[PDB]
Amino acid sequence: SVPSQKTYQGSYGFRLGFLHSGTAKSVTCTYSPALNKLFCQLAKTCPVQLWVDSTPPPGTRVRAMAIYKQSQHMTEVVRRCPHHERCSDSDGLAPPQHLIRVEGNLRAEYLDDRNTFRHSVVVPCPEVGSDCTTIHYNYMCYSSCMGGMNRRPILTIITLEDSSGNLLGRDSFEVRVCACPGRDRRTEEENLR
């Protein structure tokens, strides 16, 4: 099977938002609207905003999952490479095999799907004075990792779910985990032009 990647705002007007971090060679995470693609360094904080037009019910959750972007690879489970899955960089909560972690949320749950074997991380659902909520993700392998992503592009799919896991909303973005996100974004954006 292959998870749907179709954008779906749903009843609550769910969609993502990204900061404007620029493309300085020092930057650790940067998002390209033109490419709908996030470029980030290994294991660095990736702030992703969650926007809604109205507040979803108590018990609503937000799940993240990675899939390969190319159709010929889409049935393969995205996982950490043979090196990184064994490097004992556990935060005590994320399984060592999971590519995507949520940073600084003790209520994060990590799922190994019993049927598809795919990995995901899910958190429960702004503060006073704020207009959106932000989740902080980490990507724990480089796009280039041999025996893992192996230079294949991935997408992250973010789904808004009810307490049963039923779909309420969906958005997605491509991700490249690389040493120099600023330069790579600049390069790919120029290539697109």
Which segments are annotated as binding site? Answer: 81, 84, 141, 145
Contact code string over 117-156 relative to Zn ion, x by CB under 5 A: ------------------------x---x--x--------
Residue number, 16 or 29, with CB nearest to Zn ion: 29
Q: How far apart are CA 82 and CA 85, in angstroms?
A: 6
For the record, the structure tokens of 183 come out as: 């330069």
The H or E element that residue 187 is part of is helix 181-192
**Residues 74 to 93: which contact Zn ion by CB under 5 A?**
81, 84
**Residues 24 to 83: which contact Zn ion by CB under 5 A?**
81
Laid out side by side, the sheet with 154-161 consists of 29-32, 37-40, 167-177, 154-161, 61-68, 119-124, 109-112
Closest approach of Cβ 33 to Zn ion, in Å? 28
Annotated binding site for Zn(2+): 81, 84, 141, 145
Nearest to 14 by CA among 175, 164, 162: 162
Closest approach of Cβ 144 to Zn ion, in Å? 8
